[PDB]
Amino acid sequence: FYTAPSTESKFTEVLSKAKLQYPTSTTVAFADDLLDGYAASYFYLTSDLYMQFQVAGSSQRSELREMETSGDEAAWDCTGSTAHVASAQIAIPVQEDGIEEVTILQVHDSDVTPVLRISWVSSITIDGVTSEDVVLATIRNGIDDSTATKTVLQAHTTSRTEFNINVQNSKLSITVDGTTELDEADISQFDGSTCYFKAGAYNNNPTDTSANARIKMYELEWVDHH
Ligand SMILES: O=C(O)[C@H]1O[C@@H](O[C@H]2[C@H](O)[C@H](O)[C@H](O[C@H]3[C@H](O)[C@H](O)[C@H](O)O[C@@H]3C(=O)O)O[C@@H]2C(=O)O)[C@@H](O)[C@@H](O)[C@@H]1O
Ligand SMILES: O=C(O)C1=C[C@H](O)[C@H](O)[C@H](O[C@H]2[C@H](O)[C@H](O)[C@H](O[C@H]3[C@H](O)[C@H](O)[C@H](O)O[C@@H]3C(=O)O)O[C@@H]2C(=O)O)O1
Numbered sequence: 001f002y003t004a005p006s007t008e009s010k011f012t013e014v015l016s017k018a019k020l021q022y023p024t025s026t027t028v029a030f031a032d033d034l035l036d037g038y039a040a041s042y043f044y045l046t047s048d049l050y051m052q053f054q055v056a057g058s059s060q061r062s063e064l065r066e067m068e069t070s071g072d073e074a075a076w077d078c079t080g081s082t083a084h085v086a087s088a089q090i091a092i093p094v095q096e097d098g099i100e101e102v103t104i105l106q107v108h109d110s111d112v113t114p115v116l117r118i119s120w121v122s123s124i125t126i127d128g129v130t131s132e133d134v135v136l137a138t139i140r141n142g143i144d145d146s147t148a149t150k151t152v153l154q155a156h157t158t159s160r161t162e163f164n165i166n167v168q169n170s171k172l173s174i175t176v177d178g179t180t181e182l183d184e185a186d187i188s189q190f191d192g193s194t195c196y197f198k199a200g201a202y203n204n205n206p207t208d209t210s211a212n213a214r215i216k217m218y219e220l221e222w223v224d225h226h
Pocket of ligand 1: 114138204
């Protein structure tokens with residue numbers, strides 16, 4: 001009894017350009033499955049036309065992974081001259097108790113390193129400054145450097161919010177409701193890597209492994225320009 005996001009034509013293109021992973025990195029629905037009405041408790045269309053992702057457990061996910069319409073996985077030069085842009089309208093609800101961080105958008109390399117995570121966090125301390133209930137950008141300092149550079153982007157609101165990630169020429173920028181919140185951060189540490197976008201709910205370090213993280217997307221798309 002779940003309505004498929006594919007029933008809304010605003011999602012047809014991105015679903016044609018995606019596959020769905022759940023609850024780990026195994027694909028449960030390819031683009032053709034998604035376009036043919038795939039729906040489940042963890043991925044469905046709400047009555048007010050949000051594509052909602054929901055998942056419980058440590059490091060579990062319900063996430064779309066960027067694909068080419070050809071069925072090739074997206075694997076663009078992370079630092080190349082072609083601009084790659086992801087845009088999304090996202091409504092982050094109040095997370096259930098025990099949910100401490102939920103990653104909603106990523107630039108991920110073609111191995112095991114997230115270039116960029118945009119995530120909601122219950123708390124974060126960045127150079128002696130503690131912020132509570134915010135949206136955060138985390139950019140890994142390298143494949144061999146586990147550390148990352150973190151930047152508060154927005155105070156969490158339940159309101160629908162426009163996010164835009166623009167990646168071009170060794171730099172990455174993020175806008176939130178049209179306002180630049182991260183201005184050409186350097187990602188040259190991923191020279192020689194290939195990259196792709198992801199969107200959904202990725203549940204990081206919950207304290208209640210039973211609680212559900214939940215994220216709603218009113219619009220979502222990813223493109224390139226040559
Ligand atoms: O505030 C810090 O910078 C904090 O980060 C700690 O390492 C983090 C790292 O910053 C980053 O958040 C990373 O993110 C993970 C993510 O949680 C998830 O597991 C994903 O699958 O992979 C991401 C990744 O590998 O980058 O998680 C690290 C973590 O240990 O939680 C430390 O550097 C810490 O000293 C520092 O205060
Ligand atoms: O998503 C993360 O932020 C996360 C960070 C960890 O440090 C790892 O990097 C981990 O990366 C995932 C990654 O996000 C993809 O889900 C990936 O999926 C691939 C798998 O190999 C699948 O089995 C499939 O065959 O192709 C997928 C693809 O590349 O699109 O798996 C890794 C991972 O779990 O190591 O998560």
